[PDB]
Amino acid sequence: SQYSIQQSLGNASGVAVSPINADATLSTGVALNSSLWAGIGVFARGKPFTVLAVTESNYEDVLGEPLKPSSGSQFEPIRHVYEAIQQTSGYVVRAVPDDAKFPIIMFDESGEPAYSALPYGSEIELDSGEAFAIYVDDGDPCISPTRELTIETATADSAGNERFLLKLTQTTSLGVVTTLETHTVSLAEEAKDDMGRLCYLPTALEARSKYLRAVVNEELISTAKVTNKKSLAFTGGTNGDQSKISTAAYLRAVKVLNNAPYMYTAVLGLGCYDNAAITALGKICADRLIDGFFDVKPTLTYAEALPAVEDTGLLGTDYVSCSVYHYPFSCKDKWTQSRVVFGLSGVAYAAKARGVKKNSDVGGWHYSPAGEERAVIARASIQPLYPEDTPDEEAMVKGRLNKVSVGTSGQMIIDDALTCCTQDNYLHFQHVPSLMNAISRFFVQLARQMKHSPDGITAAGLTKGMTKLLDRFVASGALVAPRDPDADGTEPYVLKVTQAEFDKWEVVWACCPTGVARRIQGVPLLIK
Amino acid sequence: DQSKISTAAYLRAVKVLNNAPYMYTAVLGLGCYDNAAITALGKICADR
Structure with missing residues (x-):
C-alpha cells in the first residue's frame, strides 16, 4: 500500500532505502570474566543422572541436608x-x-490407591485396573521427612470437565506439618484452569511442578473418576547403600556431565577417588579447553602419594591443564563437630576464582592458585595425620604433585602451581595453560560467529577482533615483552592472519606470558 | 463465542491493518498470542 518502503528499486521510478549494514561494528559477547564449576558426586537429595544448578542460597534444599561422617x-x-x-x-x-x-x-477407576516402589531410571507399566500413577522425581526417598499427597474436589470448568486440587505436604518426624505445593489438575485432555493454563495432569505436573511426575492409561482415562482421598502416604522409597558404587555409575554420570548443554570453566573432582572417573574428567578438560582440580586420596602416606599420581592416569601430554592435589591432614567438621578428613579441590577452585575476580575488564587468568593472599585454607583445629613423616620436595616436584605448607601468620596455604604435564617447558606451570585456553575459547567464539563470510570482510574482522582482544590482555598485564629482545622482536604478541587456499583462513598468534615468582634468591655483598 | 478464533480471522485483520491508509509508528501486539499473527505483524514492521 502507501507509506510502504521498498528495497530493490530495479529499473523503475521510485525511492528505496537499503537495510542497515551494521557490519563494521561487529562485536563479540563472551564475558570472559566468568567462571563456573562442574562436578559429580553422591548426595542425599536430587534427581539422579541429571545436571543440576547450585547457588549460594539453595544448595541446602536442592541437594538435601548434609550427610553424616x-x-x-x-x-x-x-x-x-x-x-x-x-x-x-x-x-x-x-x-x-x-x-x-x-x-x-x-490409582484405579474407583479411586482406591495402591503403593509401590521402582528403581531409578525406569519407566512405569500400568496394570489393567490402573488409571494413573503419580511418583516423585525430586530424588528424595521419602523416609525422613515423610511426604503426603491429598486430593480435594473443586468446581468444574466452564466447559464442564472436573478439575481436582492436588496438595503435597511434608511432615517431619517431630510433628511439624507444612504445605509444600498445590495445583489444580484434571484428566481431561483439553480442560483449562482459572488462569487459562493447560490443566491436563501429565503435562501440567511435568511443566509447572518440579517435585512430582505422573503417567496415565489411555484406555481407562475416559471413564476414570477420582474420589476425595485425604492424607495419603508415599512409601517404599530407599536411597540404598551409598558407601560402594560401581564404576559404571560414575562413568554414566561423567558422560551426562559431558553432554550437558551448559557453560563452565572448571571440572572439579568432587571427592571421587576413582581412576576411571578421573581419566574421564581429564578427557572433559582436554575436549572443552577448561581447567581441572583433582586430588588423590588424602589418607596416603607421602611415600605412596607419588605412585598414586601416576596411577590416576593424567600424567602425560594430553592433559596439560589438570592439577592434582594431596592434603594428608585432619580437621574438625563445621556441622557435626567430629574428626573428618577430606580433599582440597574446593579450596583450589576457590583460590582460582579469587584470582580470576581480580581484573574486571577481562578477568585475571594469569594469577596462580597459590600464595598467602589467595589460597589460604580455612579449617578448624588442623591436626596432622602423620607428624612423624616429612615431605619429599624434589620428588614431589618431579612427580607433579602440589604440596601444602605453613605460610606466614601460621595458616596453611597451597604452595605450588604445577600441572600434570611431564615436559619441562612453560606448559607445566598452572597459569599459562589457563590464559592460553581463555584466548582459544574467545577465538572459537569469534570464528564461529564470523564463518561463511567473503574474504574481504573476513580478513579485516578477524584482524580487528584479535588485535582488540590481545591489546586488552596486554593492558591487563598477562603478557610482557619477550625475554630476549634480539631474535624474537620486542612485541608482547605477534598476530598473522593468512589464506592457505580458497577457504583455509589460518590465524597464528604468538604471545609471551608473564613470569610467576616461585623461587626468590638474595645475594648480599660487601663493597670495599 | 469470542473465546476461540480461527487464525484466518487474525490473518484477515492483520492484512486490513497493513492496507490501512494511516500513519503509525508502533505495531503493538495487543493480547494476541498467535504465531501467525505475530509473524504478520513483524512483516508490517519490516515493511513500514
Whole structure:
C-alpha cells in the first residue's frame, strides 16, 4: 500500500532505502570474566543422572541436608560443594547406587490407591485396573521427612470437565506439618484452569511442578473418576547403600556431565577417588579447553602419594591443564563437630576464582592458585595425620604433585602451581595453560560467529577482533615483552592472519606470558 | 463465542491493518498470542 518502503528499486521510478549494514561494528559477547564449576558426586537429595544448578542460597534444599561422617565415605562431596560455592554457582551431577528406589502411587477407576516402589531410571507399566500413577522425581526417598499427597474436589470448568486440587505436604518426624505445593489438575485432555493454563495432569505436573511426575492409561482415562482421598502416604522409597558404587555409575554420570548443554570453566573432582572417573574428567578438560582440580586420596602416606599420581592416569601430554592435589591432614567438621578428613579441590577452585575476580575488564587468568593472599585454607583445629613423616620436595616436584605448607601468620596455604604435564617447558606451570585456553575459547567464539563470510570482510574482522582482544590482555598485564629482545622482536604478541587456499583462513598468534615468582634468591655483598 | 478464533480471522485483520491508509509508528501486539499473527505483524514492521 502507501507509506510502504521498498528495497530493490530495479529499473523503475521510485525511492528505496537499503537495510542497515551494521557490519563494521561487529562485536563479540563472551564475558570472559566468568567462571563456573562442574562436578559429580553422591548426595542425599536430587534427581539422579541429571545436571543440576547450585547457588549460594539453595544448595541446602536442592541437594538435601548434609550427610553424616559416621555413615561412611559419602560425606565428602557435600563439604566440597560447601567450600567451593563460596565464590560462584555451579553444576553438579548426582550418581546413585543400583538398588535405589523411588515411591509410586497408582490409582484405579474407583479411586482406591495402591503403593509401590521402582528403581531409578525406569519407566512405569500400568496394570489393567490402573488409571494413573503419580511418583516423585525430586530424588528424595521419602523416609525422613515423610511426604503426603491429598486430593480435594473443586468446581468444574466452564466447559464442564472436573478439575481436582492436588496438595503435597511434608511432615517431619517431630510433628511439624507444612504445605509444600498445590495445583489444580484434571484428566481431561483439553480442560483449562482459572488462569487459562493447560490443566491436563501429565503435562501440567511435568511443566509447572518440579517435585512430582505422573503417567496415565489411555484406555481407562475416559471413564476414570477420582474420589476425595485425604492424607495419603508415599512409601517404599530407599536411597540404598551409598558407601560402594560401581564404576559404571560414575562413568554414566561423567558422560551426562559431558553432554550437558551448559557453560563452565572448571571440572572439579568432587571427592571421587576413582581412576576411571578421573581419566574421564581429564578427557572433559582436554575436549572443552577448561581447567581441572583433582586430588588423590588424602589418607596416603607421602611415600605412596607419588605412585598414586601416576596411577590416576593424567600424567602425560594430553592433559596439560589438570592439577592434582594431596592434603594428608585432619580437621574438625563445621556441622557435626567430629574428626573428618577430606580433599582440597574446593579450596583450589576457590583460590582460582579469587584470582580470576581480580581484573574486571577481562578477568585475571594469569594469577596462580597459590600464595598467602589467595589460597589460604580455612579449617578448624588442623591436626596432622602423620607428624612423624616429612615431605619429599624434589620428588614431589618431579612427580607433579602440589604440596601444602605453613605460610606466614601460621595458616596453611597451597604452595605450588604445577600441572600434570611431564615436559619441562612453560606448559607445566598452572597459569599459562589457563590464559592460553581463555584466548582459544574467545577465538572459537569469534570464528564461529564470523564463518561463511567473503574474504574481504573476513580478513579485516578477524584482524580487528584479535588485535582488540590481545591489546586488552596486554593492558591487563598477562603478557610482557619477550625475554630476549634480539631474535624474537620486542612485541608482547605477534598476530598473522593468512589464506592457505580458497577457504583455509589460518590465524597464528604468538604471545609471551608473564613470569610467576616461585623461587626468590638474595645475594648480599660487601663493597670495599 | 469470542473465546476461540480461527487464525484466518487474525490473518484477515492483520492484512486490513497493513492496507490501512494511516500513519503509525508502533505495531503493538495487543493480547494476541498467535504465531501467525505475530509473524504478520513483524512483516508490517519490516515493511513500514
